[PDB]
Amino acid sequence: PEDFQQHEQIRRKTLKEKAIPKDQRATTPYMTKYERARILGTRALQISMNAPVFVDLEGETDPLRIAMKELAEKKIPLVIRRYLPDGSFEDWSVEELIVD
Amino acid sequence: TFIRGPICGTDNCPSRLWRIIDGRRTCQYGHVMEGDVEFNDDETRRLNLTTNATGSFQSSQLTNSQLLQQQQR
Amino acid sequence: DRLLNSSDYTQASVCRECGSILTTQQSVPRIGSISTVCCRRCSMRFEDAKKLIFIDDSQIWEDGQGNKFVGGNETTTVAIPFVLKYLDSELSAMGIRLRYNVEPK
Amino acid sequence: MYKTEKVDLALNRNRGDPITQHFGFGNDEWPKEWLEKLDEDGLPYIGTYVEEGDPICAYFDDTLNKTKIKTYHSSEPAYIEEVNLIGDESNKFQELQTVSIKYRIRRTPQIGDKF
Amino acid sequence: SAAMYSRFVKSALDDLDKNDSTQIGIIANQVALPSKNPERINDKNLNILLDILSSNINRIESSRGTFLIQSIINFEKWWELPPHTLSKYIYFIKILCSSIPKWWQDVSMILVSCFILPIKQTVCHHDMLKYFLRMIPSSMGFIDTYLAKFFPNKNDTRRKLVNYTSNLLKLRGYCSELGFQIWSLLIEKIISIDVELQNELGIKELSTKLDSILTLVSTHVEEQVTPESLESGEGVGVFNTLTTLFKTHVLPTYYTRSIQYIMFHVSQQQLELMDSFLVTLIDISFAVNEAAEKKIKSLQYLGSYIARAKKLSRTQIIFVASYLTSWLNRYVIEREEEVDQRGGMERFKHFYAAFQALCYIFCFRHNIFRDTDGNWECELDKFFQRMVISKFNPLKFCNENVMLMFARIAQQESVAYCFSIIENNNNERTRQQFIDLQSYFPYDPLFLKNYKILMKEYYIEWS
Amino acid sequence: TTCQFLTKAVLDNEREQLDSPSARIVVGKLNNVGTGSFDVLAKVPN
Amino acid sequence: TATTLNTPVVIHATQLPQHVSTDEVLQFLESFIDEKETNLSSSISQLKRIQRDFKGLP
Amino acid sequence: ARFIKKHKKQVTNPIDEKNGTSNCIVRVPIALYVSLAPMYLENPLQGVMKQHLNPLVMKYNNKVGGVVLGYEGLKILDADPLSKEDTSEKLIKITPDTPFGFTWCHVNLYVWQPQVGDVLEGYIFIQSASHIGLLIHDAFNASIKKNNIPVDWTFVHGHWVDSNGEPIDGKLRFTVRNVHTTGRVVSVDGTLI
Amino acid sequence: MDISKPVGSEITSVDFGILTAKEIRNLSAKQITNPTVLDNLGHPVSGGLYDLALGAFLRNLCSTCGLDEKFCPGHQGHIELPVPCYNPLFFNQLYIYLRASCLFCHHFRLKSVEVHRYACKLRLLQYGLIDESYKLDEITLSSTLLNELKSKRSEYVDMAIAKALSDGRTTERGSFTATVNDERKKLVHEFHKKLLSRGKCDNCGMFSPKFRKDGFTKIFETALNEKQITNNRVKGFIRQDSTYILSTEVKNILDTVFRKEQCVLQYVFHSRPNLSRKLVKADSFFMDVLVVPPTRFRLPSKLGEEVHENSQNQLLSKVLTTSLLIRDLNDDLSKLQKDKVSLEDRRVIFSRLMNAFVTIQNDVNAFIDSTKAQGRTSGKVPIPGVKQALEKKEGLFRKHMMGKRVNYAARSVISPDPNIETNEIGVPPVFAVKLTYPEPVTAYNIAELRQAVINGPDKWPGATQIQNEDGSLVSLIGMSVEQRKALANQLLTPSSNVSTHTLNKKVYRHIKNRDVVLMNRQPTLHKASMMGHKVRVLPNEKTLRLHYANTGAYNADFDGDEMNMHF
Ligand SMILES: [Mg+2]
Ligand SMILES: [Zn+2]
Ligand SMILES: [Zn+2]
Ligand SMILES: [Zn+2]
Ligand SMILES: [Zn+2]
């Protein structure tokens, strides 16, 4: 059991080391088109398997058209983890990315 | 147009497990057999195998034994 | 989608110690509880386990020959194509193993 | 477009065996909508309309004691123009082991037909 | 035989100590034969085999005796032995499955699978389960899988369904800790036979398959809930698991009417039940969080229940119909300025279905509405005339046939005027899942026979 | 030539690290270029 | 039987276990069945029979 | 050289005092990598208990070693390693191909574990000629078989009668010989000698 | 693939290795002994190549796990061998370390500090330190002189390793980059050339004899020379404190070398830090056993109506027959007494075994490869081996792993249509019936999935399957209207369980005007020739309809061009 706890202190200390803190995020402030497609991909996979939707549907039936609508009000509760090729990452929320 | 077989691997039948709803086998009342797919080989020493049913191999040409020899005499 | 999901996509199983996909089998049950998945390579013969404390009860299994075994129970299931499982067969004829690392450990 | 398939059961016979299966109807139960498309010797009526699933010959086996069947395989609905009864060039063997059916397939100018 | 066959099995048990076990293996082939075969071990030979085992079970707990136990427990028609060998076979299981408590899960697979027989042949099956499900208390869990695994199919025989249903209701009778999953088993399965029948409105099989099962629940539950089981027992528990499965199973399924009749039967046992069954249909017909299709479908469960429930009083019925008329009056306060707005009439489809309940209640309980004094209830003249002169117009968008019957019994009392707007209809000249939803009344006359005979307690007719 | 690159890699006990888009098709992971270049986390409350 | 929708994929014991005395077992057993009141019922029924036994009531 | 001795029960069980019996109820803190459905995205603590900790109540699980009674203190480990412990919005990694969230957990499992060589005292609910049937703590089944019964003890029609000539009933003290855990039910093999 | 069953475990790295002889004999089930494959009845022999512990066959059950032929994974068995054998892929790296060993000194014919130099360069190059490996030439100043050169070299390696770990320059698992991978291929190419350019043994002065090979793994040990025995016998005092050579004596010298040459051969076969400390053994070049594939990877090859033997069963047959000619002739010399045997009878047995010790090895060379075996039956286009299925254009890697075949895809002739949009495609009603899409049931589409189940499999828009909450499919093909409406009203009914209390029914709806396809035209030159169009379902045709604005991208001309379509 202690050989797991000694193992777990490594994995948490590495992920704390890899994570770039919030003030130093030097990547782009935009939503690249590979990020927008996966946000509407995963959010439409959650609406389809009964997640709570945060908008009013207005008679839509396709789960892609709901998650397209929910991005237009910045209600999507996801977090993008932009990897750098050393291992590091920067948690950018969806609400703070300029979609274009 | 059917083919007899097991009942079903569920309690929700009896049936004679009819033939191929394309790809897999089916019972009468709907339930697709879960799970096996029809095999096929699209492209020496000749053996005594008679693969016929769903691409799987069957046995040699001895039938139920004495009936071919009782009815011949 | 075109090269894993809609060609083969077999959810196989691996061992989390020897890391192979080909040496796992369903143990035939005892008296008649549920069956469980076990691995041949990590396991010992049970009489060899009695030669080296009491051996636990839940970590014994048996194949369809009645032979007992201990160990080989740490296993999970991953999602691979099937042609990997054919390749692991073909490489073991040449004497080559392909040990996998399956995370989380 | 015409198209000829040779219905055969003289194969797999191992050079000296008795006539294991015969043409013609048996005497046990058989589902009796085979009679709508097959004549009473196990050969189809000339001019019928075959689909994928209809029978083309009904050979009654003996070593399995059952009124078997042979089916149309291609998915295109064809008619039947000619059936020939080929006899043996060698000696007797005379239970009609080789039959030749010719299907006539309609080809109307569709969309996608090269001119 | 009397002394040699006792020494024969004792010389079979002796070879067990020397790991041989072939005269065990022959005698194991002797036990597990069919009962219909005269090559079997007879009755007095079975007496000799069982007391030499019940004397000492502590020798055959080996890996090489597991065919000996398996030959015993798979005794084909074991319960049809004479009762002097039957009382020792029964006494063997009460020692085997308590000395070695790993063998209970195999015999419990047999005692539950053999419940496809009528109750008068499995009287010793149910005595053993009430013993072991209190004495192996951890076995209360996995037998729930065993109940649902062997339930017969909806296209199986009429023999197997009704014998399996009636044997389960015996198991409901004493294991109150299971409770939920038995009622969840049948109501999930009787609904699987019911949605065939509404489309028939293989008929003669599927109709007579369910009415035997649907009677055997209703006659059982009218005995289970009683006046001495509400204030003193657990009849409030039988009601709640029946009313929480009406909400979860019979609400979301579509186009059914034979299963809500079991709540047309339990609810009429007392008066506080029909208040609680009413308050069940109230807070789901008005809660704002659900979609409209549950507030529409439950309002049809409100209109067609109160119209057909035999035991009712104005101290409930008018007092909710007073607040219903206030719920309409508070609906014509806010949204009668939202009737000229940019939008369609679909915004008040909840209202016309709410108003539909009033023109169904009026067609069946109008002689109740007359008080002693000779005045109507809650200013009907200030109500039935007032709602139709608005721009809402609840004659056009509501039902065509069950509301036209109301406009005959409206002008049999002249309480309102609505035929000139019918003359306005032919003057002025997404929805299909709702248009065919208000044409659905749950408690219409049943097409079955036996359950209509049971329903002359409290079901009324159109007369 | 498949045997040549195979016999060099076994004699070296070379751990493949699954980074090329031809290695991830063999094993059956998600690719690295394009949309498989980040992770999407969810934000659950409490 | 058991997919990964009702099974953890691993369980690892982080620490060594600590032997707890009965008076805190009764405090845990009290405060657990209060907070657990659909398939939990047939487990907490058996748990109700345990807590009566520790205080001592046959 | 090589050891497979890591199945050893590392904590021995004490003997309670003042009594003659043991204590076999422990508290072990575990960590576990669970799944999480896309419908419990607003109640993730409620959704882990309803999906992964409730099927472990009152059954056997060999990783903790005994029988799990219950749990306390479920804390979802956060995937954002710069947040604090007082936050109320934690992050959970979503699988690529599927919408099912996967995560870690920390929780305390109260386990009742018996071992070979301990003293247990339990009730009697059947006395037969070949065993004595036993319940421990009115939940778990035990047996004291005939070959482990001492030779100076007698039977009568029935109930067993001791060396001095009295019936035995109720709380019969014994020591453990084996713990059988094969099927879906625990089994404690006892011994009186 | 199904989005209701998720996986939790992920594969991250595929380490390699060699299957060892103690490894296979554990995991195997039933050792294959019998050279035949079937008995007379049409049934597999208990011990032959179709054994029922190697996979369920015709209708039986697999004797190890006990499942049907549609549930058995298969298991692999093993053939025993009395001779070890030469592994025909690991041959030239055995052939190089043969011609560099000293048969007397039991070391290499190179020096003792030159080898220790190449070890200490290869250790630092494991950790990526390309600089300190090159500064090891900068350490140079008899008996204790070479134990002072070896001491400061190993201190300088240890000083550089622990300094490069104080910061994050490297880690204990070791870095490896394509630049660090380059220098390893230059040292090893130099360390193998320096071992093959030796004459006299530079450790103890002796002269080692010659070896020379053939392609069929025939090596002939050449005897010595008179000048070199003259150096051997006069150096017999300091060391005082063309016959065909078989397999087992070559084994016996190489365990003796590899026990002594650990600290240099540890780093030749390791491009990463050895954390398990698995010692290198010379058994890793010799195939003591032979793992046969499972029965399911050895099914007979149907051709028309006949059934032929599997081609790998033939190459595994001839191994097993020739292993019975030797195993009889092994016990032939032992049952016959060793004093009764003459000088001729020991020499006529030793001209029978030496012909059969070749043909056991020239069949392992035939089972693995086809080029590296004998020229048989005048061309004949011979039986391909194991390597021949793992090869070029039609092999395994370039036909079944990089480019596959797909479900849910169609192809037909194209035809023009200007009356649709530029971003559309005209799907005819013969593709709009067979192509489906699993669309799960929630509250917003239950209005439309009821109407799409009632419509049945042969009316667009319709559906062709249901799927229950536990994976159990229910088709709709044969069902009539009162049975489809029996299922259409039961889509949202909860099925009570504790496992699947989250999941819900997926209906396999038809393709619609909402969906998106992925057209394609072979040959696909540039990436703008695999586009994605929105479906527009047209009636009364059989060809795909396309707008003219997309005929710049696919290079299409409407005279018989065919285009795929995915989904
Ligand atoms: Mg062209
Ligand atoms: Zn079926
Ligand atoms: Zn393993
Ligand atoms: Zn198998
Ligand atoms: Zn030396």
Numbering used by the authors:
A (entry chain F): 55 to 154
B (entry chain Q): 3 to 45, 57 to 86
C (entry chain B): 1090 to 1141, 1151 to 1203
D (entry chain B): 803 to 917
E (entry chain O): 48 to 248, 324 to 551, 581 to 614
F (entry chain A): 1617 to 1662
G (entry chain D): 12 to 48, 80 to 100
H (entry chain G): 14 to 170, 215 to 250
Anything the authors wrote about it?
The transcription of the ribosomal RNA (rRNA) precursor by RNA polymerase (Pol) I is a prerequisite for ribosome biosynthesis in all known eukaryotes. In bakers’ yeast Saccharomyces cerevisiae, a basal initiation system required for Pol I activity consists of the promoter DNA core element (CE), specific initiation factor Rrn3 and heterotrimeric core factor. CF binds a CE stretch between ~15 and 38 base pairs (bps) upstream of the transcription start site (TSS)11 and recruits Rrn3-stabilized Pol I that is primed for initiation. During transcription initiation, Pols are recruited to their promoters by a set of general transcription factors, forming a ‘closed complex’ (CC).
UAF was assembled on a dsDNA promoter scaffold ranging from position −155 to +8 relative to the TSS together with TBP, CF, and a fragment of the protein Net1. A final cryo-EM reconstruction exhibits an overall resolution of 3.5 Å and shows a Pol I early intermediate PIC (eiPIC). The twh and linker domains of subunit A49 are detached in the eiPIC, agreeing with a proposed role in promoter escape. In the eiPIC, the sandwich region tightly holds the promoter in place between the wall and protrusion domains at the bottom of the cleft. sandwich elements contact both DNA strands, therefore rendering it specific for an un-melted duplex. The TFIIB-related ‘reader’ and ‘linker’ elements within Rrn744,46 are mostly ordered in the active center cleft of the eiPIC, with the exception of the residues 46–56 (B-reader homologous).
